Design a protein around this ligand. Structure first.
Ligand SMILES: COc1ccc(C2=N[C@@H](c3ccc(Cl)cc3)[C@@H](c3ccc(Cl)cc3)N2C(=O)N2CCNC(=O)C2)c(OC(C)C)c1
Length: 86
């Protein structure tokens, strides 16, 4: 089985803008919708497309960074865990 987690308000709002419909998700579902948000907002770098630019988007406040690479899975997981109801 997989644990169902509960995104805090800001993260949840970004997930729902990407199409998410519920309030609890597996981590796989959180990541998927977050990736969809990034694609929709065109936050990825044009030239190195694994790089995500947050400096001009609310995602930047949420995570607390300016850029991250989708290769940094531990960093991304950490940023998400900071934004779950404990
Ligand atoms: C070569 O370009 C790529 C390569 C891989 C990813 C990626 N890889 C996936 C991923 C990344 C990190 C983790 Cl921890 C798990 C899965 C997933 C994802 C999930 C969460 C976040 Cl915050 C960002 C991306 N994520 C994506 O969402 N992708 C993958 C392919 N299909 C998509 O719809 C876009 C990618 O994401 C963009 C949105 C930047 C771009």
């Amino acid at each position: 089985m997989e644990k169902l987690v509960q995104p805090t308000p800001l993260l949840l709002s970004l997930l729902k803008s990407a199409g998410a419909q519920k309030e609890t998700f597996t981590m796989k579902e959180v990541l998927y919708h977050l990736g969809q948000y990034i694609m929709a907002k065109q936050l990825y770098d044009e030239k190195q497309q694994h790089i995500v630019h947050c400096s001009n988007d609310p995602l930047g406040e949420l995570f607390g960074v300016q850029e991250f690479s989708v290769k940094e899975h531990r960093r991304i997981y950490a940023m998400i865990s900071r934004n779950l109801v404990s």
